[PDB]
């Protein structure tokens, strides 16, 4: 194992090494979100079916939040289990679009209906307007389960990097507040906490796709010297994690977040909190959404959506 980096993985980013653009940190948040929808849009699955996909707004407490609902191809007209989704993209990029494929991947591969969040993005909203919004919607979606025919018994929340830091956070805060009833959390490499030094920090800090400075620069766009302690954006620092909804965590080797997407793994067990850990050693980050580019992804995908489509049986 003189690198057990994915042979796809290493192609993907000595291709992307010998392009001469900008990286998207050193852009502008537009030229940064575009850069990144391009990406997507290249490295992703291309034309998935869905049964139905449908665009709203939802009541938020700073304005309309824009959803997007997606019903399973051949869905019979039972109430559904629904996985209320939050995309990655450090809280400054990333949106509907840019995650549409692996939530038509979960609706069809878990037979659930997904919501997913367009919630506020930094730095024009910053902390912790992200995790207000991605609450909201957890609540609209338990008090409305009837209208779009969901069982509110069966809500799962679930993020990919800061969308993952997001589901952690909804979760404890729900659980705080004795409501919504989150039945599962399914955390895709997800930012837990603010330290960028820890051991897997500083061994994949560059060349990895998501880079130790690329963390900061969301971080610096998203919290206003704002506690960076502060559990709604740094979850594993919470007094108690007893109690929070059963987890399946993913992390990924070549990842800066890897150690603490473990620790949190490892906290929630510790705490009683029934959590399935899978660690896929060669790839990098970001991976659910380069399901065009690495088998990996595909099978990742997949068993992520089997273990969420068990739970809520």
Known sequence: FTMA????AKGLLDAMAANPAPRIIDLPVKEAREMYRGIAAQLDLQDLPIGKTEDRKIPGPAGDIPVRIYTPVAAGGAALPVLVYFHGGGWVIGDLETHDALCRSFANEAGCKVVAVDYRLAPEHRFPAAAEDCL????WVETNASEIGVDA???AVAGDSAGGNLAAV???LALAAKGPRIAFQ?????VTDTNVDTASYRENASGYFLERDGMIWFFDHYLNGADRTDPRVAPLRAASLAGLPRAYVITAGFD????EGRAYAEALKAAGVPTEYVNYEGMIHGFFNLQAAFDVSRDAVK???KALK????
């Open 303 to 305: 068993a992520a959506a």
């Open 5 to 8: 980096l994915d042979p796809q």
């Open 153 to 155: 018994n069966r809500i």
């Open 170 to 172: 909804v979760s404890q």
């Open 136 to 139: 909201a919607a957890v609540k």
């Open 256 to 259: 800066p977040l890897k150690d």
């Open 186 to 190: 399914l955390l895709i490499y997800p």
């Open 310 to 313: 068990e739970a809520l049986a």
